[PDB]
Amino acid sequence: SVTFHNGRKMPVVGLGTWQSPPEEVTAAIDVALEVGYRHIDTAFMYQNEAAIGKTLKKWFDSGKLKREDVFIVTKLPPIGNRAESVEKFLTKSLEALQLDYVDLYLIHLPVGFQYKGDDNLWPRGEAGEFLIDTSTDLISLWKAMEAQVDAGRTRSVGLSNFNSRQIARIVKSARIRPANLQVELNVYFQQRELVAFCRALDITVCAYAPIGSPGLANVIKARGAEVPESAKFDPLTDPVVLKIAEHHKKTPAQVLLRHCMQRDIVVIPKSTNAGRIKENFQVFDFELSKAEVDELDSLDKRAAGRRFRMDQYKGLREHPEHPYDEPY
Ligand SMILES: NC(=O)c1ccc[n+]([C@@H]2O[C@H](COP(=O)([O-])OP(=O)(O)OC[C@H]3O[C@@H](n4cnc5c(N)ncnc54)[C@H](OP(=O)(O)O)[C@@H]3O)[C@@H](O)[C@H]2O)c1
């Protein structure tokens, strides 16, 4: 586990739910909690929160799992990056999860979309134009997040896909500092600089896409987008990681997760598969040498790097709070 600055502990392994359709996410969470997962990462924009709630309500009502024993993470949709809309969406998230509180609430994206509808995650105009909110003000938005911990709807609040300057701006204004930053991170994109930046401010880094995102290429092409060349790199096929995997008699995925975890970095591998779910949890048992760490450190591609880029549309790159123009 990793402990936030406010003293709350966060499990270092959680189960990602993007993209886990509700037909699959319910059984996958049943499997995850049987495995030992005590941390679930979801979001309002993933459209699986209601299914998670169904499974959680079963384990809470029936089974021997207490709510204080599980760590629930959801996020504010880019269509709510305005202080006024924050409690609306978290209230909507909570009732789908059927919980009275989440453990961690993140600003999903620095870049806001104009709210053109509650259930309209990707808003368009009279023309096919993509409705972006040029007016995203983070200081104001963050104060609404702070007000959510005071209402007890969330125990901690944090940021996702934010850069240094925007984290620094928020923390220097923060009545309650960010508890967690969730950015893309794996051995091909280790984010050395941003982790050390956050650790200096006692901000814990949760790593999404920790074993690379193999499904993502097919997902980017499913949406109207172009598959980046960094998405053509599989860190589970890399010979370095396979060599280290045989040394420990472990699988590449667990090697990749381990490398993150021993940097005190939370990781949320996403899996529908009941075997692969179990596979990614059996990772608290082995320690990586100081020498295999540096072979894994050599694998880092730093900038680009990113497969989860934010350059699909002109107005999105040109939005004043675009995080990936800065070095980190
Ligand atoms: N902007 C954001 O904040 C953002 C965006 C996207 C995702 N995320 C977070 O990251 C989580 C997903 O991360 P990801 O799925 O992008 O990265 P990833 O988990 O590293 O890639 C997961 C993919 O690899 C497969 N896989 C999972 N465990 C495996 C294993 N042990 N061995 C081999 N293959 C395995 C899965 O296939 P099966 O499903 O068939 O197992 C899935 O397609 C999401 O739930 C979300 O919480 C955050």
Author numbering: 7 to 334
Direct quotes from the study:
In this work, we describe the AKR from the termite C. gestroi (CgAKR-1), a founding member of a new AKR subfamily of potential biotechnological interest. CgAKR-1 displayed major structural differences compared with others AKRs, including the differences in the amino acid composition of the substrate-binding site, providing basis for classification as a founding member of a new AKR subfamily (family AKR1 I). Generally, members of the AKR1 family have broad specificity for aldehydes, are cytosolic and monomeric proteins, and interact strongly with NADPH as a cofactor.
The three-dimensional structure of CgAKR-1 revealed a conserved structure, known as the (β/α)8 barrel, within the AKR superfamily. This structure consisted of eight β-strands in the central region surrounded by eight α-helices. The NADP-binding site is buried in the protein structure and is highly conserved throughout members of the AKR superfamily, despite the low similarity of other regions of the protein. CgAKR-1 displays structural determinants that underlie the preference for NADPH, which is related to the positively charged arginine residues that bind to pyrophosphate backbone and the 5′ phosphate group of NADPH. In addition, the catalytic residues were identified as D47, Y52, K81, and H114 and were also conserved. The superposition of CgAKR-1 chain A with AKRs complexed with substrates indicated that the substrate-binding site was delimited by the amino acids W24, M51, Y52, H114, L115, W128, R229, F314, and M316. One major feature of the CgAKR-1 structure was the presence of a longer loop (known as loop B) between the seventh and eighth β-strands of the barrel (residues L222 to L242) compared with that of other AKRs. This longer loop also exhibited high mobility based on high B-factor in chain A, which could not be modeled in chain B owing to the absence of a defined electron density. Consequently, the unparalleled long loop B from CgAKR-1 seemed to play an important role, not only in cofactor binding but also in substrate interaction owing to the arginine (R229) positioned towards the substrate-binding site.
